[PDB]
């Protein structure tokens, strides 16, 4: 890529780790999730792929500096996409059921957590497996890779595991917490060096990442679920069931709550005005200011389950339960929509040229630059 993948903007804070910095989409979370392409896409179809899929909390494609698409589908495939659709590679025999973001790390690594309780390296120009972690239960976040490489993965047996690789052929663990209660808020970290995640015990935690000590923890009558963002100032922005959004100061203070009309159904964006955007079981796509009034919201016939993809001009793209692709400008105005037969839950992904990669249950969908 021309420019380099970054974490942050000047409005966001996550702390920066060992993404593949020459990729295009590296990793799907634990980033602003404003690109920093621009696009012309107009809701034309470029191609369609079959990838039968269920990706855990809107997880879907990782595309790399060469512009190959990656992506796990449900049959225990690994598939890497050249742009124009054709294939590269497949790799078999990985999990089933479940489905998660090939991240791209350094060293043209790939790290997916599979439900077969592995967590994989795999060399990104050939499919071919370097090795594997065992878990102790099957995965069920994205791995977010810290600043010395440490992957950090919640497991389906209550537990955080801290895995560092020390080549991409070989891995120590770093610590792991046992939680309190079942994982919804998948682990992400904030530049002060803390990992957030919370359970279904209605326990929000807040944990040093280097020594998987708990610094603080909240409580709420219902969990968090998905993917935080982190501002500036280290504020974690969480969906909660409840339906509200939380905003969560550096030191656990409740900066401010946001109503969704229904549980929060997406992970977040945020972007460089320090606006963040999440969708609802209401079925609309919410876009709130850093001190928690309502920009604008978007209203769509099904829980929106993708989290928000921002561009460098400002629109914003999503996924409907009512099977639409959707793309809207800064305002949150329509730009345009396109129906599709399967419900639109793996978050969209933006390729250097414009290309607009966005997934459902049973499909990878390109839609082309104008
Ligand atoms: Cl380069
Ligand atoms: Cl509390």
């Not at 970054?6 to 602003?32: C, E, V």
């Not at 690789?165 to 970290?189: C, D, I, Y």
């Not at 900066?255 to 606006?275: E, M, Q, R, V, Y």
């Not at 959707?326 to 399967?342: F, H, I, L, M, P």
């Amino acid at each position: 890529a021309e420019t380099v993948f970054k974490q942050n903007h000047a409005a966001s804070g996550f702390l920066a780790g060992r993404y593949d910095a020459q990729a295009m989409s590296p990793t799907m979370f634990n980033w602003s999730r404003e690109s920093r392409f621009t696009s012309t896409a107009d809701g034309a179809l470029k191609w369609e792929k079959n990838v039968p899929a269920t990706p855990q909390n809107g997880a879907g494609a990782a595309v790399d500096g060469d512009g190959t698409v990656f992506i796990q589908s449900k049959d225990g495939k690994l598939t890497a996409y050249h742009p124009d659709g054709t294939v590269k590679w497949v790799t078999e025999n990985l999990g089933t059921t479940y489905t998660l973001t090939p991240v791209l790390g350094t060293n043209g690594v790939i790290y997916l957590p599979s439900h077969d309780k592995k967590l994989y390296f795999i060399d990104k120009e050939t499919g071919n497996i370097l090795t594997s972690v065992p878990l102790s239960g099957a995965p069920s976040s994205d791995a977010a890779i810290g600043p010395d490489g440490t992957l950090y993965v919640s497991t389906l047996d209550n537990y955080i595991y801290a895995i560092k690789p020390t080549s991409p052929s070989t891995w120590t663990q770093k610590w792991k917490f046992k939680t309190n209660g079942v994982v919804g808020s998948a682990p992400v970290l904030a530049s002060n060096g803390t990992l957030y995640t919370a359970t279904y015990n209605n326990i929000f935690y807040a944990i040093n990442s280097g020594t998987g000590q708990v610094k603080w923890s909240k409580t709420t009558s219902n969990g968090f679920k998905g993917y935080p963002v982190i501002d500036r100032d280290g504020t974690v922005y969480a969906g909660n069931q409840d339906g509200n959004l939380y905003a969560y100061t550096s030191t656990g203070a409740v900066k401010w709550t946001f109503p969704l009309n229904g549980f929060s159904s997406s992970s977040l964006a945020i972007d460089h005005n320090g606006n963040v955007y999440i969708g609802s079981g209401s079925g609309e796509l919410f876009s709130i200011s850093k001190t928690g009034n309502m920009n604008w919201s978007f209203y769509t016939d099904g829980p929106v389950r993708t989290a928000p993809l921002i561009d460098a001009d400002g629109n914003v793209y999503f996924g409907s339960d009512d099977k639409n692709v959707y793309a809207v400008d800064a305002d949150g105005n329509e730009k345009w929509r396109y129906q599709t037969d399967s419900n639109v839950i793996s978050s969209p992904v933006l390729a250097e040229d414009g290309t607009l990669y966005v997934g459902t249950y049973t499909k990878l969908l390109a839609f082309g630059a104008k």
